[PDB]
């Protein structure tokens with residue numbers, strides 16, 4: 507099976523390298539990037555991200571709900587456009603299918 511856990515880990519590395527301030531919105535604020543995998547808050551968040559990707563592939567993703575929840579953290583289209591790029595990098599790094607359409611789907615509600 508596609509190693510989505512590894513893709514997501516690389517996704518967050520790319521995302522927070524390019525936009526460190528995004529990390530401040532999470533329960534793992536301030537944690538060194540090389541230590542995220544040993545952080546309990548990060549582990550929970552990464553697992554939810556993996557679940558969302560598997561839901562999108564499986565046909566059950568709630569893009570409206572995910573969008574609404576991100577608006578609820580003042581995260582919007584600009585951040586998701588930036589995320590699209592980081593996730594494309596992470597997918598390519600793993601020979602994984604591109605997830606741009608999943609991000610576009612979320613973007614359609616932002």
Ligand code: HEM
Nearest residue numbers: 528529531532533554555558575579581585586589590593
């Ligand atoms: C690849 C695009 C992204 C995906 C698939 C994604 C997915 C998720 C999921 C599944 C959750 C949990 C929602 C829930 O529990 O109901 C979440 C929460 C969250 N996301 Fe994202 N996200 C993405 C991009 C971003 C970006 C760019 C930011 C910018 C800061 C962000 C900030 C947050 C924050 C602050 C939370 C709440 C975390 C908490 O409850 O402590 N996300 N995201």
